[PDB]
Design a protein around this nucleic acid. Sequence first.
RNA 1: GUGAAGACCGGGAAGGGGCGCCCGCCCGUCGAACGGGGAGCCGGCGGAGACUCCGGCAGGCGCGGCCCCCGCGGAGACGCCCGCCCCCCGGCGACGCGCACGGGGACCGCGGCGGGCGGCGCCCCGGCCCGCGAACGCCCCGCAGCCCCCGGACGCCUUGCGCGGAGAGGGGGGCCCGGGGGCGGACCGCGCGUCCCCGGCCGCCCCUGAAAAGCCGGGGGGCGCCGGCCGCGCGCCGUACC
RNA 2: ACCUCGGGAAAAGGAGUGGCUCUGACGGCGCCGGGUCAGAACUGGAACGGACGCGGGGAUCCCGACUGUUUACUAGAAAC
Lengths: 248, 90, 119, 95, 72
Amino acid sequence: GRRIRVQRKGAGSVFRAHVARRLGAAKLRANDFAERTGSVRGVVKAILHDRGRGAPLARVQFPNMRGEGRVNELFIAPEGMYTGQEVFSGNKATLHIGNILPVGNIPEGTYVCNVEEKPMDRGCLARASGTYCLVVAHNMETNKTRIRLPSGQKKLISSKARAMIGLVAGGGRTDKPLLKAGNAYHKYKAKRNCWPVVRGVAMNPVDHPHGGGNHQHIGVSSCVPRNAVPGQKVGLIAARRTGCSGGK
Amino acid sequence: AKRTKKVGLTGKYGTRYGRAARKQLLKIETSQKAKYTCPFCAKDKVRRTACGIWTCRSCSKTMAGGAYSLHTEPANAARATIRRLRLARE
Amino acid sequence: PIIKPGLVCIVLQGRHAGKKAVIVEALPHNERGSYAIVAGIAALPRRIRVRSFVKCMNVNHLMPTSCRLENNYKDFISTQTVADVTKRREIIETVNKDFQRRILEHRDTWFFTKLPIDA
Amino acid sequence: ADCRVTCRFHSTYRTRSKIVRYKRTPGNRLTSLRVKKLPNAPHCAETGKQIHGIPRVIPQHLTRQQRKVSRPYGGKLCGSALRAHILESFLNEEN
Amino acid sequence: PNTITEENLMKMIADGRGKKLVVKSCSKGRLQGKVKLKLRTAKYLYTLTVPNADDAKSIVKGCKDKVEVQYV
RNA sequence: GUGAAGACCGGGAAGGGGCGCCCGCCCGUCGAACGGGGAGCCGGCGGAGACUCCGGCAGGCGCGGCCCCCGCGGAGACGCCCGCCCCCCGGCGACGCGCACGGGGACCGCGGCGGGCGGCGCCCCGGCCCGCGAACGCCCCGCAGCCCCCGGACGCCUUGCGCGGAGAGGGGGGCCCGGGGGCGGACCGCGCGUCCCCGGCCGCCCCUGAAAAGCCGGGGGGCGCCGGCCGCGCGCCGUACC
RNA sequence: ACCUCGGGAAAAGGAGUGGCUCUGACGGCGCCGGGUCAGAACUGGAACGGACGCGGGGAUCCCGACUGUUUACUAGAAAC
């Protein structure tokens, strides 16, 4: 049997990210002494379009704290960031959209983005268009803050972990139907070679486990175990339940 | 002078793409091409450069916004929360 | 009535922008607009000579401030002077010497401190 | 009768640099003259607007008076951007 | 090539600045009845179009005899 | 770092710089005879070649000799008569697609006029052939666009638009405009298209349309020039022909 | 007819068309450009998009919505 498409995709080669002409990695300002004891001030130079990301990315210039120059930082843009906005990063930063403060300071019910999963991680949580985390509770005794992740899961993070106030912009991007195969082609060019997708029932028995008989059928339960080997895991992985049913 | 009775800017897609998709797009694409009032220069010149990026033609101010509307409904609710919560602290 | 003799302003538009000036004379408003004969610091005392600009500038190009710098100045500075070639050059020397004296004694520090403009 | 100029450049591929305009030589033949891509004149750091005074020539062949503007921040800032900076610097000091 | 700014520039260059030859072309084709004095300095060829032939003669005398003068 | 090796994999490592000092985390003299780039045009010549030869005429980039000396003007936009280094903040290189519209250049066509032909049984001022002007140097203009100054409005305008108390109109100016004219190099008009470039717009995207040498401004600091004229130099390889 | 109101649709079908001799419109006037769009006579073996270039059409049923893509060198499909 041939190495299946998922097996081939992990070997890099043609399935790598189309990262050419991309602005950079969107991350929060590095935790520093003036962000630990005080607030640094930065002006939003430009709101720009990253190639593979629907959400807009904002270039905010901060003073160099270890030199005489200026430091340019690319961040995910929270909705409402304007050219010339004075954002503040630090422990004493005020509660305004676009300011980055530790989430223990941030009151509960606030909508935040680019939250740090762990202290000084530069931001790893709500970064996609229109997404947001919600400050749910503060546990003062453990110095831990519960947040509701975009999937509705709730996680306990450090109170020290920093977050940028505001929904990330580009919201409602998924509502418009792509309409044409064309629009999907354009969007996927910007991201990676993952389109078009051929069903494995359409393929030969050598190419895919679902393979091919005379009647184009899976022929065995699509549900596959969690301990399936790399070629075998092609169906519904460790499905706790299947089918379209109301509830939850 | 009313060139088409029901389909609006969706007349571009002819008879293809179905009725449901063309109805959703009518609303989505009316918002995308709409001129919105500048939050700064109070002039209806804001237009969408890119998804999530809106620039005032007269104000010259570029603002982060919803993909097809300058302001998303979630975002307006978030702004009201932050303003109230900030005021509660002070 | 802010515009007055002995008023310090900052030139906003011109080759001498960012540099503080003093309103020696305020011309009566005419068809040209409202104009003021201003004498200002073209150059700081030194990197670690003081130079003076003596021209008439539209009061739209001047940002009024609170400091005054009270000087005799108008005795040698008039609409007839600053206008002709020469004489203005002579008054530039008299003003530049006066500025040197007001720096040597360390007087009017705000006037003689450069405006910190960035970007 | 047959104004087929042929190709002045090393290769026939017509990129932005390889563009030719035709004139008549004193010997009565059509000629190909390379059209050089005009360099953009400098732009404001704030506003991004073509600064006035400096012509659209490589600044290597311009001369200092023609590649400079007689004002503080003459090339970097425009006279409106500079006026705005002058005002803010003074006003922020007052408060 | 350039046009010399009158005889004052032409003779100032011909008296002291670099000069090799002053060539006097005469009324070619009768488009003009004027005479053209052309000086080759190191940098350029400078031409003075003189309306009157007599006017050119006085200008030629002004050019030093060290400058070669040719007539065509 | 690893693998029996062959070899594969790779920042976390006392990894430089004119220069005592001082400054400094850390690759490329790899990769494109289509991308970027400092600067070339005309005329002529040979049996075979030319953006290369030769003649004319420029431009770029150095180097030397010599002289020289570090601002000024305007109300302002800016103008004009050119400093350098570091450290910073920029700019240029540097950028998508399309419909239409406008402006140039070439091409074309039609007249006139000057020169030369051909045919002619009949006509024929009806046919044809030719009438040339490069790079570059100055000077003067150049729509639209942007900006200044007076001043204080439903007006100004496009093919489509757009624009205006965050400053219109009107009046007078500045700037950019791969362009034109004059002069230097050195036949006269007129029109419709074509083709190429360019301009201001407008439309489009869950698509937003490379980078880097190189060059150039500005701020601060330190220091001390710049310029002109006159000489001189520019190596290495490719270059026939299909 | 039908329709997802966009289409169907060049639906289906008809009629005219050449050359001459004129007459209107339309800008920039004294002038001076335009080359399109109409209209009329008169003619011609009852001829004219006179070569050339250049949809035959209508009613159904099955299948796949569609534009796309594919077994280079026997399957362009209803397959992908």
